[PDB]
């Protein structure tokens, strides 16, 4: 129920917070799950991932009501 | 159809090729679709993402190993 917006949708909206974290994830479904979990913890209904870095991976996503 | 593998599954398999490209991210669903399409064009049944860089929140550079 906590879903990722595409950039065109997110661009029209105002985020209330963001999440930023690092970890070792099996695939893109797992990355999305990890973001969604942190998003849901913060009361977001949606998110949009804004950064993905190599180093494990580091991910940053904006959160939306 | 073409399926994404997780790390442990891919680790036991041997890829035959990879895809590497840069394009519009959109969201994970949309980028996964782009990877799957390129995998399908090369004859793969599975892929595993090996690298990803999204550093300025527009484009993403990705690579993926391909498997039969
Ligand atoms: Cl795994």
Residue numbers in the entry:
A (entry chain A): 247 to 301, 305 to 314
B (entry chain B): 247 to 314
From the article:
The DUF1471 family includes several hundred members, all occurring exclusively in the Enterobacteriaceae, such as Escherichia, Salmonella, Yersinia, and Shigella, among others. Many of the basic features of sequences in the family of conserved proteins from Enterobacteriaceae now known as DUF1471 (PF07338, alternatively, the YhcN or BhsA/McbA family) were recognized soon after release of the first E. coli genome sequence. These proteins are characteristically small, single domain proteins of around 90 residues; though one subfamily has three repeated DUF1471 domains. Most DUF1471 sequences contain apparent signal sequences that target them to the periplasm. The fold features a three-stranded antiparallel β-sheet with another, shorter N-terminal β-strand parallel to strand 3, so that the strands are ordered 2-4-3-1 across the sheet, with strands 1 and 3 parallel.
SssB (STM1478, also known as YdgH) is another Salmonella DUF1471 paralogue implicated in pathogenesis. SssB and its homologues contain three DUF1471 domains (I, II, and III). The structure of the C-terminal domain (III) of SssB was determined by X-ray crystallography by the Midwest Center for Structural Genomics (MCSG); target ID APC101565. Protein crystals diffracting to resolution suitable for structure determination were only obtained in case of the fragment 244–314 corresponding to the SssB-III DUF1471 domain, and for this reason the solution state structure of SssB-I was solved by NMR spectroscopy. Despite the fact that the crystals were pseudo-merohedrally twinned, the SssB-III structure was determined by single-wavelength anomalous diffraction. The final atomic model refined to 1.45 Å resolution and contained two molecules (A and B) in the asymmetric unit. The molecule A of SssB-III structure comprises residues Lys 247 to Glu 301 and Asn 305 to Lys 314 whereas molecule B comprises residues Lys 247 to Lys 314. The SssB C-terminal domain (SssB-III) adopts a dimeric form in the X-ray structure. However, the relative arrangement of monomers and the dimer interface are different from those of SrfN, and likely represent a crystallization artifact. In the SssB-III X-ray structure, residues in loop 2 and in the neighboring transition (loop 1) from strand 2 into the long helix exhibited particularly high B-factors and are likely to be locally flexible in solution.
